[PDB]
């Protein structure tokens, strides 16, 4: 409905998609924090992450909470079909 | 009118022989040629090709008159023969085979630009635009 | 703004200038057929390129089974309550997230942006 | 359903894949033609009003 205002040095798509990406990143960070929030002292993932032997604090959240958002060439999944990503969506769908 | 309520029946014959070969002479409608203006015509096979294959050269009105070039169509009986149907005094129809299709087009007897000369002129003109710059 | 073809040899008529009555004359190079110009302008160059694609989209797009549909926005010229919308899908994609609609009723073909 | 209860009997019925194409219920779709099509992934879930 043309209610967005581009920022200095940003196209509307940029401004558009980079704002969408920022919202997605905030949601992913919240999900990861929630996943980290719930572990026990007897947990065996936390036992290899804390001692630094093998693993990282994001594998815990990816196994327990959310895999996250994929991207090729450093940007969101492109439109490989014409105005679609797969034949199971409707055209120009920009949802998450 | 008779085009609406008109009715009739006529016999059709297809003679196994003719005294003359039958061809089609086609004109662009867009020209709307007045055939009445054709007092006379000459018709000869085109000389660029220096016979049956030869394109036709049509010269209207003998000496002073129009001129067209006719180019043969690729095919005429490759899948379906074409017939000329003519009405006879007995009402019966007579059918004539189409031997060939020639395409006739109008000719421009004006302006003669020359090859080597044209190319030479283009370079000088091209050169002139580049010269005297800024 | 348009183009002019000769009436004798069917070629492109060029503009020329005569130093007698101060009127634009269209001339041919092959033949020298002549006539005067009615609008008396030759060249125009649109750089804004703000052409509204409401003049370029076709009415039969409403036969596409791969486009979204809507029950909210009805057609004005016929009152049908089903439309099919899409984006510019062309160049000039700097701020191009408008949403053109097309009525889906048979033999209406009404188009409108918002 | 008439196509299923007679397709589970190919052993002594002589009704097979070929009699299924020739009845107009399946169709081969190329890649170019696959841009003018609208696919559903699963019947019971995507074809409900
Ligand atoms: Zn001319
Ligand atoms: Zn309508």
Curated annotation (Swiss-Prot), chain B:
Subunit structure: Heterodimer of an alpha and a beta subunit. Interacts with GTF2F2, CTDP1, TAF6/TAFII80 and URI1. Interacts with GTF2B (via C-terminus and preferentially via acetylated form); this interaction prevents binding of GTF2B to GTF2F2.
Phosphothreonine, modified sites: 114
Subcellular location, record wording: Nucleus
Stated role: TFIIF is a general transcription initiation factor that binds to RNA polymerase II and helps to recruit it to the initiation complex in collaboration with TFIIB. It promotes transcription elongation.
Gene expressing this chain: GTF2F1
Descriptive protein name: General transcription factor IIF subunit 1
Inducing stimuli: Up-regulated in response to enterovirus 71 (EV71) infection.
Family according to the record: Belongs to the TFIIF alpha subunit family.
Modifications the protein undergoes after translation, according to the UniProt entry: Phosphorylated on Ser and other residues by TAF1 and casein kinase II-like kinases.
Superkingdom to which the source organism belongs: Eukaryota
Curated annotation (Swiss-Prot), chain C:
Residue positions binding Zn(2+) 1: 6, 9, 28, 31
The keyword Transport appears for this protein: no
GO terms under cellular component: nucleolus; nucleus; RNA polymerase II, core complex
CDD domains for the chain: Zn-ribbon_RPB9 (cd10508)
InterPro entries with a match to the protein in the record: DNA-dir_RNA_pol-M_15_CS (IPR019761), Rpa12/Rpb9/Rpc10/TFS (IPR012164), Zn_ribbon_RPB9 (IPR001529), Zn_ribbon_RPB9_C (IPR034012), Znf_TFIIS (IPR001222)
Subcellular location: Nucleus, Nucleolus
Entry-linked Pfam families: Zn_ribbon_RPB9, Zn_ribbon_TFIIS
Ranges annotated as C4-type zinc finger: 6-31
Amino acids binding Zn(2+) 2: 75, 78, 103, 108
ZnF TFIIS-type: positions: 71-113
Primary localization class, coarse: nucleus
Keywords: Acetylation, DNA-directed RNA polymerase, Metal-binding, Nucleus, Transcription, Zinc, Zinc-finger
Sample GO molecular function, one term: zinc ion binding
GO biological process, one term: transcription-coupled nucleotide-excision repair
Assembly description: Component of the RNA polymerase II (Pol II) complex consisting of 12 subunits.
Known function: DNA-dependent RNA polymerase catalyzes the transcription of DNA into RNA using the four ribonucleoside triphosphates as substrates. Component of RNA polymerase II which synthesizes mRNA precursors and many functional non-coding RNAs. Pol II is the central component of the basal RNA polymerase II transcription machinery. It is composed of mobile elements that move relative to each other. RPB9 is part of the upper jaw surrounding the central large cleft and thought to grab the incoming DNA template.
Similarity section: Belongs to the archaeal RpoM/eukaryotic RPA12/RPB9/RPC11 RNA polymerase family.
Name the UniProt record assigns to this protein: DNA-directed RNA polymerase II subunit RPB9
Name of the encoding gene: POLR2I
């Amino acid at each position: 409905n043309n209610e967005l205002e581009p920022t200095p040095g940003n196209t509307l798509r940029q401004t558009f998609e980079n704002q969408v990406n920022r919202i997605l990143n905030d949601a992913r960070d919240k999900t990861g924090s929630s996943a980290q929030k719930s572990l026990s002292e007897y947990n065996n993932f936390k036992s290899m992450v804390v001692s630094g032997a093998k693993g990282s604090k994001i594998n815990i959240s990816q196994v327990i909470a959310v895999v996250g958002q994929q991207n090729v060439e450093g940007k969101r999944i492109p439109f490989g079909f014409k105005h679609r990503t797969l034949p199971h969506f409707i055209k120009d769908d920009y949802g998450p | 009118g008779p085009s609406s309520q008109n009715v009739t029946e006529y016999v059709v014959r297809v003679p196994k022989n003719t005294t003359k070969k039958y061809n089609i002479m086609a004109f662009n409608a867009a020209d709307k040629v007045n055939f009445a203006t054709w007092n006379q015509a000459r018709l000869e096979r085109d000389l660029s090709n220096k016979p049956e294959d030869q394109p036709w050269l049509l010269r209207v009105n003998g000496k002073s008159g129009r001129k067209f070039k006719g180019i043969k169509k690729g095919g005429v009986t490759e899948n379906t023969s074409y017939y000329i149907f003519t009405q006879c005094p007995d009402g019966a129809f007579e059918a004539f085979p189409v031997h060939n299709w020639y395409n006739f087009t109008p000719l421009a007897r004006h302006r003669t630009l020359t090859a080597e000369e044209a190319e030479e002129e283009w370079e000088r003109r091209n050169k002139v635009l580049n010269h005297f710059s800024i | 703004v348009g183009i002019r073809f000769c009436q004798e040899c069917n070629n492109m008529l060029y503009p020329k200038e005569d130093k007698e009555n101060r009127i634009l004359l269209y001339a041919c190079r092959n033949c020298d057929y002549q006539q005067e110009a009615d609008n008396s302008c030759i060249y125009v160059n649109k750089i804004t390129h703000e052409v509204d694609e409401l003049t370029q989209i076709i009415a039969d797009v409403s036969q596409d089974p791969t486009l979204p549909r809507t029950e909210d926005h009805p057609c004005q010229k016929c009152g049908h309550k089903e439309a099919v919308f899409f984006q510019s899908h062309s160049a000039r994609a700097e701020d191009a997230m408008r949403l053109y609609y097309v009525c889906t009723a048979p033999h209406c073909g009404h188009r409108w942006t918002e | 359903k008439r196509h299923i209860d007679q397709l589970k009997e190919r052993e002594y019925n002589n009704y097979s894949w070929q009699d299924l194409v020739a009845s107009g219920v399946v169709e081969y779709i190329d890649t170019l033609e696959e841009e003018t099509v609208m696919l559903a992934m699963t019947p019971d879930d995507l074809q409900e009003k």
